[PDB]
Amino acid sequence: KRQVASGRAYIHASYNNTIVTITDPDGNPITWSSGGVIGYKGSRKGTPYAAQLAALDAAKKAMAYGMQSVDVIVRGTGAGREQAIRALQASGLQVKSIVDDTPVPHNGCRPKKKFRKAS
């Protein structure tokens, strides 16, 4: 609708969902999808297939905006990360590159109990 051509694809993988966001060359989102955006409602969202689908939903909706080439950026380490990547590559969009940018503190905040017991 605005014609952007080339941009960024952000994969936010986690153990509960995969949410993809495509943005213009400088971070502003164009479209987005996720296990919830598509059918899946609960546990299924995490699954890699859902990731695959969301990834495709994202690209498809992005090509409408005239997208063609993307720069992928992966954040997260969920059960479905690597699938969204293979999804975008076969989506039609050209994967110019892949980069893992998962945030990691240099030891800041006391984690939730669920994420402790970690020496």
């Binding site: 899946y40 299924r44 699954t47 890699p48 297939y49 859902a50």
Partner: protein, 155 residues
């Protein structure tokens, strides 16, 4: 089968089409080891197909089988409390076993009074792309993938 890998036993070729695949179908038809009666039934069927069809029954038989073979199916597997229908490929060996089994089952579900008619008509509707057999095959494949979400539990 905890030790070996129980090898598939070979069957004696057909006394007519000299086909092993035929003896097989005959075995499924057979009940109470009445292999004669089984044989007759199948043959009168190849005959009834010769009738309503100007094609060699052996070719119809094959085609039919082929259409009823499921190339995918769901298998249950317990993981984390609940059981999940995991779809997975279906070995050639089992496809054959499944196709023939269903043909006879579907055929005996039919309305025609005579056994031979049933196998005949089922065999035809089969090579055509219809019939209760082909449905089972389809209801199965539809079942698979309909659970593709769990395809990562390869099994």
């Amino acid at each position: 089968a905890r030790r070996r890998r129980a090898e598939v036993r070979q069957l004696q070729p057909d006394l007519v089409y000299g086909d092993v695949l035929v003896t097989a179908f005959i075995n499924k038809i057979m009940r109470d080891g009445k292999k004669n009666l089984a044989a007759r039934i199948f043959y009168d069927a190849c005959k009834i197909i010769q009738e309503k069809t100007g094609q060699e029954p052996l070719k119809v038989f094959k085609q039919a089988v082929e259409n009823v073979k499921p190339r995918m199916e769901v298998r249950s597997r317990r993981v984390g409390g609940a059981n999940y229908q995991v779809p997975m490929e279906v070995s050639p060996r089992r496809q054959q076993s499944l196709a023939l089994r269903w043909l006879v089952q579907a055929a005996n579900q039919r309305p025609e009074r005579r056994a031979a008619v049933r196998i005949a008509h089922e065999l035809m509707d089969a090579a055509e792309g219809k019939g209760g057999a082909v449905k089972k095959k389809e209801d199965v494949e539809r079942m698979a993938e309909a659970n593709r979400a769990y395809a990562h539990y390869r099994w």
